Design a protein around this ligand. Structure first.
Ligand SMILES: O=C1CNC(=O)N1Cc1ccc(-c2nc3ccccc3c(=O)[nH]2)cc1
Ligand SMILES: [Zn+2]
Length: 208
């Protein structure tokens, strides 16, 4: 039941999503090994992801979390990169999209930094890079990320350099504790706590 609606670059909604993509790029401690070397993206397309059933699945769970947390869903817009972006937008997030080996346990991981999620487009650690050139830093091939609506509820704070949420919590927040420029990363343990709102198609751009 999924349909993808293209946003025009003139649409304020395109512009605000692009600006969150671009403004949350940072340098990574791997010097670009996983995600490539770039300071910015070439945004090719931004599509709104419309699926009534998946939306209602999300809002039902959101109300549950909200009622468990003094009427506060603690909803964020966060990035998600994955080899499975195309199954996600059709079938929703579930246990099969979880990073089993992630540092906060087997859950589904999201980033404030678009460049962090970009490191997972071709798999963990960038995998073997793009399908066509086997290049983790490919400047040619078209990549895709999701910009997702995520319900955090009461989030467990982890200071730091599917399973269940910690008892009494609905998510985990990975707070950066060494790299002062890194933004937070988050983990949910129920696929119903995220909705893939935007599909963004882009290239990373070679610095000049
Ligand atoms: O567990 C595996 C093994 N191969 C694979 O594609 N997965 C699924 C997977 C999907 C997304 C991510 C992912 N992990 C992150 C960790 C931190 C921040 C962002 C992300 C992010 O955007 N995506 C990790 C693993
Ligand atoms: Zn390529």
């Amino acid at each position: 039941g999924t349909i993808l609606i293209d946003l025009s670059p003139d649409d304020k909604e395109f512009q605000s999503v692009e600006e969150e993509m671009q403004s949350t790029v940072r340098e990574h401690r791997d010097g670009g090994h996983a995600g490539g070397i770039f300071n910015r993206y070439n945004i090719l397309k931004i599509q709104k992801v419309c699926n009534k059933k998946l939306w209602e699945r999300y809002t039902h769970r959101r109300k549950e979390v909200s009622e468990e947390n003094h009427n506060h869903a603690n909803e964020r817009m966060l990035f998600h990169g994955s080899p499975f972006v195309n199954a996600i937008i059709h079938k929703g997030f579930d246990e099969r999209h979880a990073y089993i080996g992630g540092m906060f346990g087997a859950g589904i991981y999201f980033a404030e930094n678009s460049s962090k999620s970009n490191q997972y487009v071709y798999g963990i650690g960038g995998g073997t890079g793009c399908p066509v050139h086997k290049d983790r830093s490919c400047y040619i091939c078209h990549r895709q990320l999701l910009f997702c609506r995520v319900t955090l509820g009461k989030s467990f704070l982890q200071f730091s350099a599917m399973a269940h949420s910690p008892p009494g919590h609905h998510s985990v927040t990975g707070r950066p504790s060494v790299n002062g420029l890194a933004l937070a990363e988050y983990v949910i343990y129920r696929g119903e706590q995220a909705y893939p709102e935007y599909l963004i198609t882009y290239q990373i751009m070679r610095p000049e």
